[PDB]
Paper text:
Here we demonstrate that [name] binds [name]/IDL peptides with high, and CLE peptides with lower affinity, respectively. Crystal structures with [name]/IDLs or with CLE9 reveal that [name]-[name] complex recognizes the entire [name]/IDL signaling peptide, while only parts of CLE9 are bound to the receptor. Our work reveals that [name] is a receptor for [name]/IDL signaling peptides.
The vastly different binding affinities between [name]/IDLs vs. CLE9 to [name] prompted us to determine co-crystal structures of four [name]-[name]/IDL-[name] ternary complexes with: [name], IDL1, IDL2, and IDL3 (at 2.31 Å, 2.38 Å, 2.20 Å, and 2.70 Å, respectively) and the [name]-CLE9-[name] complex at 2.87 Å. Superposition of the four crystal structures yielded an R.M.S.D of ~0.6 Å comparing 590 Cα atom pairs, with IDL peptides perfectly aligning to each other. Given the high structural similarity among all [name]/IDL ternary complexes, we subsequently used the [name]-[name]-[name] complex to further analyze the distinct ligand recognition mechanism between the [name]/IDLs and CLE peptide families. The [name] core motif contains three conserved amino acids (Ser62IDA, Hyp64IDA, and Ser65IDA) that are specifically recognized by the receptor through a network of direct and water-mediated hydrogen bonds that anchor the peptide to the receptor. Removal of the hydroxyl group of the central Pro64 in [name] results in the loss of binding to [name] and disrupts the formation of the ternary complex. The co-receptor [name] interacts with the C-terminal region of the different [name]/IDL peptides (residues 68-69 in [name]), completing the peptide-binding pocket using its N-terminal loop region.
Numbering used by the authors:
A (entry chain BBB): 27 to 211
B (entry chain AAA): 13 to 606
C (entry chain CCC): 56 to 69
Amino acid sequence: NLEGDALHTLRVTLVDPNNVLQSWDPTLVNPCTWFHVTCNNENSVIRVDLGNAELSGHLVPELGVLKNLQYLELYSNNITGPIPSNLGNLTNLVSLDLYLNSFSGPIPESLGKLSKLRFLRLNNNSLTGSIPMSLTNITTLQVLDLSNNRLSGSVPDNGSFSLFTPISFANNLDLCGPVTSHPCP
Amino acid sequence: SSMDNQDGFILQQVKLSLDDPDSYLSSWNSNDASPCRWSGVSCAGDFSSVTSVDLSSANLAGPFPSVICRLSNLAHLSLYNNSINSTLPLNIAACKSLQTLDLSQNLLTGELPQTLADIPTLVHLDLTGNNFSGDIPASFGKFENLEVLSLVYNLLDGTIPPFLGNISTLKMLNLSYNPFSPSRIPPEFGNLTNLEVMWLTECHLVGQIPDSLGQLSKLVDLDLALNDLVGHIPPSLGGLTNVVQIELYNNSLTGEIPPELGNLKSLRLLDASMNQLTGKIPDELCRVPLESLNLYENNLEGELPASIALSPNLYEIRIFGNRLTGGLPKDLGLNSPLRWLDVSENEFSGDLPADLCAKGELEELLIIHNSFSGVIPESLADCRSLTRIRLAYNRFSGSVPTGFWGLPHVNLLELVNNSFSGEISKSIGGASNLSLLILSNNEFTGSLPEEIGSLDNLNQLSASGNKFSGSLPDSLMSLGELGTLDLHGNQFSGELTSGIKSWKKLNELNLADNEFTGKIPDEIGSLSVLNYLDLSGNMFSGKIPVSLQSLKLNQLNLSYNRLSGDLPPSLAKDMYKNSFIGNPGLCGDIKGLC
Amino acid sequence: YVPIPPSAPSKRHN
Ligand SMILES: *[C@@H]1O[C@H](CO)[C@@H](O[C@@H]2O[C@H](CO)[C@@H](O[C@H]3O[C@H](CO)[C@@H](O)[C@H](O)[C@@H]3O)[C@H](O)[C@H]2NC(C)=O)[C@H](O)[C@H]1NC(C)=O
Ligand SMILES: *[C@@H]1O[C@H](CO)[C@@H](O[C@H]2O[C@H](CO)[C@@H](O[C@@H]3O[C@H](CO)[C@@H](O)[C@H](O)[C@@H]3O)[C@H](O)[C@H]2NC(C)=O)[C@H](O)[C@H]1NC(C)=O
Ligand SMILES: *[C@@H]1O[C@H](CO)[C@@H](OC2O[C@H](CO)[C@@H](O)[C@H](O)[C@H]2NC(C)=O)[C@H](O)[C@H]1NC(C)=O
Ligand SMILES: *[C@@H]1O[C@H](CO)[C@@H](OC2O[C@H](CO)[C@@H](O)[C@H](O)[C@H]2NC(C)=O)[C@H](O)[C@H]1NC(C)=O
Ligand SMILES: *[C@@H]1O[C@H](CO)[C@@H](O[C@@H]2O[C@H](CO)[C@@H](O)[C@H](O)[C@H]2NC(C)=O)[C@H](O)[C@H]1NC(C)=O
Ligand SMILES: *[C@@H]1O[C@H](CO)[C@@H](O[C@H]2O[C@H](CO)[C@@H](O)[C@H](O)[C@H]2NC(C)=O)[C@H](O)[C@H]1NC(C)=O
Ligand SMILES: *[C@@H]1O[C@H](CO)[C@@H](O)[C@H](O)[C@H]1NC(C)=O
Ligand SMILES: *[C@@H]1O[C@H](CO)[C@@H](O)[C@H](O)[C@H]1NC(C)=O
Ligand SMILES: *[C@@H]1O[C@H](CO)[C@@H](O)[C@H](O)[C@H]1NC(C)=O
Ligand SMILES: *[C@@H]1O[C@H](CO)[C@@H](O)[C@H](O)[C@H]1NC(C)=O
Ligand SMILES: *[C@@H]1O[C@H](CO)[C@@H](O)[C@H](O)[C@H]1NC(C)=O
Ligand SMILES: *[C@@H]1O[C@H](CO)[C@@H](O)[C@H](O)[C@H]1NC(C)=O
Ligand SMILES: *[C@@H]1O[C@H](CO)[C@@H](O)[C@H](O)[C@H]1NC(C)=O
Ligand SMILES: *[C@@H]1O[C@H](CO)[C@@H](O)[C@H](O)[C@H]1NC(C)=O
Ligand SMILES: [Mg+2]
Ligand SMILES: [Mg+2]
Ligand code: NA
């Protein structure tokens, strides 16, 4: 189906030395029997579990078509390139775990449209630029780690970010504001 | 002197015109009197005149060498699998003796030269795997002796031309994988009386299949798949005396499968899947000795005719996603080397046929979302050929045959949502290829066998909603490839051990609604990829281990246990309010717990 | 070299 096609598109752009995606057969009616894919009772993908799989390569915008996806687990890998803006189209996403990768570029402003997100871990990446103010509109956000990145600018302290402590924003390039040491110009 | 030629000189001009990085044309030496012993060069007369040039797979780059046409006796030219680029020149017609032209798998771009129809000797034209664009030239209707026209995988963007029906000598029409302007199948294609192959896959075909196509008595392959064809499968198709293969899959076809298809004695492969076909599968078609019948994802209804079991050459039957009723043929698989059976998403009832794997070649048994009843046939316990078994969402009962557990090449065994009773046999140790075991929502009883731990490559164990009991086998903790362990809704008892540390690839651990006792092992923190943990509805006791806070968990439930002590400051928050309910000895800084 | 899908039955299954 469309969800299977989207996940297969990801497989072709990922480099998979240990063949963890061997079960990802696009000829199947749905990807629910694929290992590392969990589906709901309506056979729609709710989890992708690909942590610590020695995966390299880049992500695809096609991941956005997974409308019911709740858990994206791509952590502890060597995935490079930008975080796709289309991840903001994952309306039901509860966890975005892209930590311990070589992701470069900005944290997309689109991620603010993830209304139900509770966990955002982008730590231990090479991400650059400012933390979007959109993220503060995520009422459900309870865990945030943007540490060990090359981010800069003011750290938002309103909305969801009100409760967030320094360990969340530690070891960044030039972050300023109350949670940080240096105040903002 | 009139029979003298400069063929060596002409071939040297071809060599000069083309880049040869790998030096395939090294044997072409201007010092040689004749080119007849040069690589890819054949002089079939012995009069020293070149008759054939085959430069296939030589990594040659450059435009088509028009000078080659000066070889007066050239009858065969192949430049297959090269980097020939630019436009095919109109002066190719100068090659007036050519019988076969293969320029396939090249970089040729632009419009087809109309002058190709001005070669009278031409019998075989293959321009497959090129970038040719625009309309097929009207000249193509006037080919004198052409038997094979192949323009597969090009960028042709015109309508399918009716004048191609005017090539009376044509045996093969191959226009597949072209971005054609949406067009109907010309009725004039029925005038191609010697046609053996009509390959029009992904040609953006619209409209109805013409009745005229029924007049193609010599046709062996009819492929109209991956198009937007509408209307009924014509009853005229019964006229296809020699047809062996018919592909109509992924169209918008409606109406009933014609009983006239039974008149096709030579038919072996029929795929009319992914259409909107209505009515019943005809008995007359099922009487034909078919090797493959795919009618899946249609609106078909009624009983599968028992005649399909009569075929001695059936290896593939895929009729899933219909409203088919009644039972499967009793003798299905008895007389045929059945490899792939998919009758899923139907209203089928009754016992599974006893001899599905009689010929010993069944690889895929897929019968999900049906009302199949009774026990797994004992014969399937000896079907070592099976790789994928999906008996889920049926009304099956009884003990699984002992052997069925230990089939060696089975990758997925799925028995979910049945009434299967009995125990998993020690024979499960024999399942060398087993990756996914899904036994959820059954009446399975007994202890998990120690031989389940012998399955080193097992990735998923899901046995929820069963009456499984006893302490987990020590071997289960030895499964280092296990990503999912779900044993919720069972009567499992005893304690977890330090051996859980070997579950290094475990993403989900669900032991909820069991009778587990003892402390949560400190080795729970050692599980790097654990993001989902449910130990709720057990009798787990002691202090929650400090190691748990090392884990990055998206799901935690330790509710309704006997856990005691304090919630560490890390776990003392509002997001964990429903994670620690129902533990009386437990108190933390959560508004409602204590 | 673009590989060419043969003329054959479709391959969708459960
Ligand atoms: C025009 O279209 C024809 C239909 O696709 C195409 O034909 C067929 O050619 C293939 C060649 O690969 C044959 O293939 C195979 O089967 C043999 C055993 O019989 C195997 O050994 C091969 O590996 C392969 O799997 C088909 O059997 C054959 N079908 C028919 C009806 O002839 C023509 O080749 C196409 N011609 C051009 C020039 O494109
Ligand atoms: C069809 O393919 C031809 C081969 O890929 C291509 O070739 C030829 O054109 C290139 C330039 O694109 C020439 O390249 C050079 O090498 C010389 C030294 O020998 C340099 O001085 C120069 O700067 C350049 O790097 C090739 O020499 C030339 N000839 C051959 C035999 O390869 C055609 O351009 C191409 N045609 C079309 C229409 O696409
Ligand atoms: C995330 O990235 C951290 C910064 O590179 C990294 O850090 C440190 O750990 C090393 C090795 O243990 C220490 O030598 C170094 O002093 C530490 N530096 C800081 C700033 O903490 C972490 O190890 C990385 N995290 C993971 C989980 O790999
Ligand atoms: C698969 O089997 C499940 C267990 O029998 C079944 O379950 C439940 O649904 C009923 C009625 O809808 C509920 O009353 C009951 O609490 C549910 N139990 C569990 C354990 O979920 C599923 O509906 C079955 N699914 C299908 C597609 O047949
Ligand atoms: C967090 O604070 C920022 C800055 O005050 C708020 O931001 C903006 O929203 C207003 C109202 O829609 C816009 O007019 C501004 O253009 C926005 N500015 C910036 C810099 O983003 C943001 O809405 C606050 N978040 C909350 C209250 O959740
Ligand atoms: C249909 O095919 C015939 C040949 O089979 C074409 O025939 C004629 O046109 C040729 C032009 O190249 C002449 O050389 C022939 O002499 C002429 N007549 C005969 C009997 O062959 C005819 O043009 C084609 N028609 C269409 C519409 O393509
Ligand atoms: C990850 O990829 C980068 C960039 O190619 C490379 O330099 C690095 O060595 C890789 N690391 C691992 C652990 O494979
Ligand atoms: C998801 O977002 C992109 C822009 O980021 C948009 O173009 C696309 O249409 C969206 N998805 C759907 C299904 O509309
Ligand atoms: C974010 O919240 C502010 C109010 O706090 C609102 O004005 C703005 O439109 C919101 N943006 C959304 C929901 O995208
Ligand atoms: C095509 O040619 C290349 C070299 O030019 C060769 O390596 C390859 O095997 C050829 N492929 C086929 C299918 O003949
Ligand atoms: C095509 O077939 C029809 C029906 O047999 C016939 O009348 C017609 O003459 C044929 N071709 C042409 C070009 O007229
Ligand atoms: C079938 O064709 C439709 C377009 O008509 C296309 O979107 C779809 O992907 C195709 N599917 C298969 C399995 O051929
Ligand atoms: C295991 O099953 C897979 C998928 O069907 C198959 O490709 C593989 O060859 C099998 N391996 C063995 C050793 O049987
Ligand atoms: C834990 O399970 C109980 C019911 O057994 C439920 O009420 C509670 O919400 C669950 N907590 C979760 C999923 O965090
Ligand atoms: Mg799965
Ligand atoms: Mg020179
Ligand atoms: Na279609």
